[PDB]
Amino acid sequence: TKITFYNSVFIETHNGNYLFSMPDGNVDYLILDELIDYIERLKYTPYKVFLILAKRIISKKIRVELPKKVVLNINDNMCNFASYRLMPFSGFIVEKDDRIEINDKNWFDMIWNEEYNKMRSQIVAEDFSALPDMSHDKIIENIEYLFNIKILSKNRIKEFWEEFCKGQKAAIKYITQVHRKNPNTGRRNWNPPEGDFTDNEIEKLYETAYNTLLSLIKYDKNKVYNILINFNPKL
């Protein structure tokens, strides 16, 4: 930082030859009638003068300025009205960890829909609030067979237990959703059985999974947990 003193501190960096208040070198920022000649004496007229006087020196073809996170506008049709170029804009300033965005109503509408979908899809009817019949051994036999072949998996048994904690009705909803044969694809959400088979047999094992899980929802929680804990040791 080359500094020189005049009858005036002429610091000469690479970001501009600043001078707080006439050297013969190029002067970039002048940190400033008698006043006008001082600027006229400087060769290579300064880019900005940091100061009634401003009106005149603007008309002397010179820029003025009269005395944190980066702010990014996202909102752009303006108008001349009341001299300065301008637009009406109502919006939202958001304060990010390294920036300040200036968003509009469409952003808030987007995040309103994104939050409302989260809100509305958290409670599903009688949470924590005509089933077929099966003997306990038959439930053990069918869950064991459909656990060896990969239909009732540990993720399926886990997600059965989580919904059955939330009541019988949510468990029937989950089992009906997994067994549902989509009319456009002809496919159920069961994981397909491993081992060579035939589509009638595969459909009957899917039906067996539907009836064995549905006959387990009528049982007591502790009895359901003690049936499934022999297969998925977590839950």
Binding site: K96, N117, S121
Partner: protein
Amino acid sequence: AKTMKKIYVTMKTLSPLYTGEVRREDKEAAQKRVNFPVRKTATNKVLIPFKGALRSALEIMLKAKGENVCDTGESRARPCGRCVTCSLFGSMGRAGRASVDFLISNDTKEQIVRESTHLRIERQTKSASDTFKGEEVIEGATFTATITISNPQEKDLSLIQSALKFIEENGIGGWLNKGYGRVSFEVKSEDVATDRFLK
């Protein structure tokens, strides 16, 4: 111990990037809408683990060179303590000399995370058999990390940069075999004094 090497790491994505959500509650809440969520901060920023990627990079490269480097990565394997990866990344005794911060984005999930549709296509029928949705990070997204090596040796920045080239060539995280995770690194290495803060 008088010096400290600060490697500022700036990673720009040259491909889609995925790293899965590890938080169970956040994964479940996002799996109500997208089957493969991307890993996210609570400040809505994308977090890739970075220490394991660098350590794995240096372990395959240094095992290929024929050096005395063990294999952390095998199931419950014990770090020996005598390798260079045990010096730079840790053993059961001493900790790692390099504190590898997470690769955190400078941007927020609204700007860089997109939900994308992926398929499984039947070979003989040539139609969609399965469909799933996965959150990924867009190309050109810029991520930052700062590796802080305490007690810095002379061959520490070279190994970090070699591991950064290996992560550039194999990918950082996620579905690396499909084309995801191809990135580029910029290295602003420096060597600060440990008493920088004491004025």
